[PDB]
Symmetry: C3
Subunit: 179 residues, 3 copies
């Protein structure tokens, strides 16, 4: 019931945009880092995730290649998307693949879902999503108790020009091409 319901809710909106706030907190309650950004998702296999502060970070899927880019160390990494897995709440959300969801035991409390893996450094993921499909927040907890929490705002369902899901490494950027 819980897993099927979560999947049904995520299936309702396949092209959306939203801003986010992030807080990484150790088990003792100390903040490791806080940041902000925005994200765009177009199922299937397309996304643009951009952390804008306090440091910039770029993660984009053009449908074939998954790109990671850090402007500060002037490095990018390229991999084939087909090799990627649902290893972060955001990746699970972009894929919404039944084969991924079956690897977790899912519990539901209203709009709040908790996912605990069936085998083994994660402890559990949490995703809050309304009945109509609005993603409100998501969290990843590690075995050491560290928590990575995201809250989403201004969530709008729209289809943006495909140009958002493309990336070419900027001039002067060293590409670690694992493809």
């Amino acid at each position: 019931d819980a897993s099927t319901d979560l999947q049904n809710r995520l299936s309702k909106v396949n092209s959306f945009h939203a801003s986010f706030s992030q807080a990484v907190t150790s088990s003792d309650g100390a903040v490791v880092q806080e940041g902000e950004g925005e994200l765009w998702v177009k199922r299937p296999n397309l996304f643009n995730w951009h952390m804008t502060s306090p440091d910039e970070s770029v993660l984009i899927s053009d449908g074939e290649t998954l790109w990671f880019y850090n402007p500060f160390v002037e490095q990018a990494t390229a991999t084939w998307l087909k090799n990627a897995t649902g290893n972060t709440p955001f990746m699970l959300i972009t894929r919404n693949n039944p084969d991924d969801w079956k690897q977790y035991n899912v519990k539901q409390k209203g709009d709040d879902f908790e996912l605990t893996p069936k085998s083994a450094n994660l402890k559990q993921f949490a995703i809050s999503v309304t009945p109509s499909g609005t993603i409100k927040s998501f969290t990843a907890v590690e075995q050491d108790g560290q928590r990575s929490a995201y809250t989403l705002k201004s969530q709008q369902s729209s289809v943006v020009d495909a140009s958002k899901f493309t990336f070419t490494p900027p001039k002067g950027v060293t590409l670690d091409d694992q493809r």
Copy 2:
């Protein structure tokens, strides 16, 4: 006996306040973060731990409920204190529970105590003979180190409006 000595020292001061500095350093020596805050402890079961810089976070036990709060993402988590464990040096210190201490092999060097789990890598706590806590450190298996140095309505919490509470109770 090092465990007994540590417990004896901790049991000397059951109600206290201190300000703290914190530094989180990875095994390669890179600083992950540095911060400051203050804390109040009143055994049994009450505390207020507050990081004030550079990012605010609150951890409070009202004696029944353990609350975590992060104003930046406006989230709070409530759990029953009965279910908490001494999984951080601060928690071990607030509880000072023999049942927690017996889960560690404790070595002593003057005021410096090192604790290794029988079943993280290790915790360290420095406390004077009179029970003044000077510092405590937690080390993970990957070598990351979290080091702290130390220098009634307080034990209550009411989630502010617009805060989303994950009530695990």
Copy 3:
């Protein structure tokens, strides 16, 4: 093959200095921290690693003792270097010890080497044929990545004073020696 080539390149420059930028990135692409500093190495067994931003941090080997120092919390830690291990890409580089390298399966693609432990997820090191180290990265099992990029590497021999450390006044020393 690859491990022998990596070692051969590292053996060409035993005394050098470099400036570095660092970026710690979680598996979701979120930057945990960014920083910069400089480092000096003189094999065997001597080094001075200094982070200037976001906050000061100092890691020095005077050839016998390994020192960690954080001025903000006013703490230092001393241990015997003989007990140190090649537990980070930086330490592996300072040691360039065949006995360390053997604990890893090494793959090569031009100047890019990738090391996977036989018994941490992976380490990666880039070094030119002439011995110029360009970058190194560590990846944990949780997918968090610590990436260092090296700039202005100079093969030089600085004064021996760079490889010494005395705890400043008022710093508490955790002497594990």
